[PDB]
């Protein structure tokens, strides 16, 4: 039994500006003076690498706890900024009065160089830039009706940021916990499961029951936002809550008497989207938060902490052992308690996967009101969370490789799952590479074959609905099962979880909110393309992590480090052999996969879901059924999607969307500038810099800091950074301009 106690060191680090005037103080090599321009880049490259600074785990743990506080403060400042922008420079009240007619906007551009044109006529009196972040819908779902609440929330956010600033400084210069702290994974998990998530969802459920539910009910009943009672009135005067929800007449007595069924007025399970706003029923959302809170709270009492009751993660890990895995998960507990890189890899992979799942679930089941009708917001949110998820996944792979190169130990990883995997890494990577080849052929080859057939006039020999058909029978079957679930497998559910599986369509403000997303041959091919790209990117990352320590080409890659340029022009060439380079390649592949994924979502939504509905139910999509026969060929993807939909971003000049068009061009430049750093080497730039330095010497204007070219690894990093920035910015401007100009 180990005491889960708190031990801290007081005044461990002094608070002074002495170290601010000595850049590179955290590194022994960087504290001796630059001597070259490469030191400037190395200073920032190794600034947040706390593991390279010192060899003590305690110091790294403290440098992480702090700086986590700093990032939390940065997030709180950003949130406060969003709330203040909504309260001061946004048409939030006007939007509340007419959510469908008024375009959300919370940014006002200053009139200086003709940029005042960017202030679009979003309505509501004010003119500004239309925001697609969903801030307006979220605030409405939270019960915000006046800008005073937005101002108070902004002030509270600023205060929380100040608190997260003080906490970060206090936990590094006034009270720094010892390594025994931070190694209590059982206590940290129990608290995060029952306090950070469990109690958090419980509190949010309470807020929704007492604020979101009544305010939104009155809003959806035709009551003006100014005439709705204040949130505190619903708590003080129980008569109002009783009138809006008779369940409140019984009070909390039913909860304590197990007569939970009496809460059918506030805790419903309707299942579908609200026909008035198009979003999920707030009652179902509150009931969902209550259930997730109770489930997380119960889950938070699993591990053992300072008491006999509970579980030991190490015991559970070591208990799992089988014939095909000699030692099972033995030694993994010590791995996740002595290396922050391993924990960061697992957490980054899970956080990225969670973000991707969030994107899918948010578009399919619009949670906020009027979110579905605001297609710009829907496109931006799905695409945004999809991108952040992919970036976090690539980062997860990078940190896994980092741990493998630096924190790995043969004694700890002996005959366990990790060691057993490293033993047969060749089978893993060759079989996975074979899967990638098969997927690419059977996914992209289908598209290429269709291009060849259509060009030859042999349309009868294509992979389409009319010609050879490839129907996702399994996915279509799951959709049908979901369509029939509300009556045979969900007895208490009154409607399908998502109308995208089937049921009927929902229209709000003469606009389609969510209708069944039928899958055909085009969806079959695109889904296989998605799987192919995911397989190749995971192959690149897994290869980099498995061979991070050694390989048949370089027997001691670990000694060379995780981030090294190459072993030289030997053994035929060992360029981009380090794991860091594998992450560098995985970034491009993740970008390609994610770009294709967002492209499919955008086109499919604009051709089969998003659109207008005329009286009597007639439906007219933005691109009427063109995805069925145009998404099956690369030519169609270039003509009906990249060319047809780009007209909005190229013709945006002279209007409020001109900025997007400008960003559309700028991004291209950046994407084309990255090529400079990707198809070139530092030897040539060093020679060019030598000639330029001679020119400077001829005028006695040479700098003391010897100018040097970017390192090989730094050059690769700059190239990938510019490539991703340009590509994501181009598709960002294209998506936003296309969705704002139409729909």
């Amino acid at each position: 039994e180990k005491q889960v106690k708190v031990v801290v060191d007081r005044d461990v680090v002094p608070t002074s500006f002495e170290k601010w005037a000595k850049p590179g103080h955290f590194s022994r090599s960087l504290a001796k003076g630059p001597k070259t321009t490469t030191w400037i880049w190395n200073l920032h490259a190794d600034a947040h690498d706390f593991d390279s600074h010192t060899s003590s785990l305690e110091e790294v743990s403290r440098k992480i706890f702090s700086a986590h506080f700093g990032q939390l403060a940065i997030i709180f400042i950003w949130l406060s900024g969003m709330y203040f922008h909504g309260a001061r420079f946004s048409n939030y009240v006007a939007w509340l009065s007419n959510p469908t007619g008024i375009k959300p906007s919370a940014q006002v551009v200053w009139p200086i160089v003709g940029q005042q044109i960017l202030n679009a006529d979003v309505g509501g009196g004010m003119q500004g830039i239309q925001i697609t972040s969903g801030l307006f819908q979220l605030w409405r779902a939270s019960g915000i009706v006046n800008e005073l609440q937005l101002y108070v929330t902004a002030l509270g956010g600023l205060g929380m940021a100040g608190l997260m600033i003080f906490a970060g400084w206090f936990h590094y210069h006034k009270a720094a916990p010892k390594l025994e702290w931070f190694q209590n994974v059982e206590s940290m998990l129990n608290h995060h499961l029952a306090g950070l998530l469990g109690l958090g969802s419980l509190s949010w459920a309470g807020h929704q029951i007492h604020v979101s539910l009544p305010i939104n009910k009155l809003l959806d009943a035709g009551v003006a936002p100014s005439s709705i009672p204040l949130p505190h009135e619903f708590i003080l005067n129980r008569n109002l809550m009783a009138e809006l929800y008779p369940s409140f007449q019984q009070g909390l007595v039913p909860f304590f008497t197990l007569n939970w069924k009496q809460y059918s007025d506030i805790l419903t399970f309707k299942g579908g989207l609200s026909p008035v706003t198009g979003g999920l029923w707030l009652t179902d959302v509150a009931h969902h938060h209550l259930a997730i809170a109770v489930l997380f709270l119960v889950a938070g009492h699993m591990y053992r902490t300072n008491w006999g009751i509970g579980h030991s993660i190490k015991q559970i890990l070591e208990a799992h052992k089988g014939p095909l895995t000699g030692e099972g998960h033995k030694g993994l507990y010590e791995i996740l308690t002595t290396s922050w890189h391993a924990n960061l890899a697992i957490n980054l992979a899970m956080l990225g996967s969670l973000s991707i799942i969030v994107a899918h679930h948010m578009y399919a089941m619009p949670p906020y009101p009027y979110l579905a009708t605001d297609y710009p917001t829907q496109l931006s949110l799905f695409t945004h969370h999809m991108w952040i998820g992919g970036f976090c996944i690539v980062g997860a792979g990078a940190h896994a490789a980092i741990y493998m190169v630096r924190d790995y130990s043969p004694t700890v990883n002996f005959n366990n799952v990790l060691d057993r995997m490293i033993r047969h890494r060749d089978a893993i990577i060759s079989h996975l590479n074979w899967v990638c080849i098969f997927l690419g052929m059977h996914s992209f080859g289908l598209y290429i074959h269709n291009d060849t057939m259509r060009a030859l006039g042999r349309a009868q020999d294509m992979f389409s609905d009319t010609a050879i058909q490839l129907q996702p029978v399994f996915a279509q079957w799951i959709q049908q099962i979901h369509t029939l679930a509300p009556g045979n497998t969900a007895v208490n559910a009154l409607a399908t979880a998502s109308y995208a599986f089937g049921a009927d369509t929902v229209t709000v403000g003469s606009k389609i909110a969510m209708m069944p997303i039928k899958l055909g041959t085009a969806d079959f091919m695109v889904h296989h393309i998605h799987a192919f790209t995911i397989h190749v990117t995971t192959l690149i990352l897994l290869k980099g992590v498995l061979y991070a320590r050694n390989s048949r080409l370089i027997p001691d890659k670990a000694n060379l480090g995780f981030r090294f340029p190459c072993d030289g022009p030997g053994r035929g060439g060992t360029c981009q052999v380090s794991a860091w380079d594998h992450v560098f390649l995985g970034l491009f592949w993740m970008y390609n996969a994610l770009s294709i994924v967002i492209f499919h979502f955008s086109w499919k939504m604009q051709s089969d879901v998003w659109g207008t509905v005329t009286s009597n139910g007639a439906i007219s999509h933005i691109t009427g059924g063109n995805f069925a026969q145009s998404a099956i060929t690369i030519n169609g993807w270039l003509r009906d999607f990249l060319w047809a939909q780009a007209s909005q971003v190229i013709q945006s000049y002279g209007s409020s969307l001109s900025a997007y068009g400008l960003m559309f061009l700028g991004a291209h430049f950046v994407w084309a500038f990255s090529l400079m750093f990707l198809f070139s080497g530092r030897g040539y730039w060093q020679e060019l810099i030598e000639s330029i330095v001679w020119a400077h010497n001829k005028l006695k204007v040479a700098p003391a800091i010897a100018p040097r070219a970017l390192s090989i690894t730094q050059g690769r990093a700059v190239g990938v950074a510019h490539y991703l920035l340009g590509g994501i910015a181009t598709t960002w401007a294209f998506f936003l301009a296309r969705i704002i100009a139409v729909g």
Partner: protein
Amino acid sequence: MFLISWRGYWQELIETLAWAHERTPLANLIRWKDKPVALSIVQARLVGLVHFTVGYILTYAAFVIASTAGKFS
């Protein structure tokens, strides 16, 4: 492809493929006469430059011919 990815990722990949080919039944009989190896550093630059050049020329050739044809035909 060749202009971005350099030799070293492909060398290890080919080693993995070599292991797979010589460790699978019914296909061990077939043995490569020349040991598989990744494209050399300079060979990669030349192959990538040739691909880029072929694409640049063919893309603009198709564009110019098709545009001048459809526009005036």
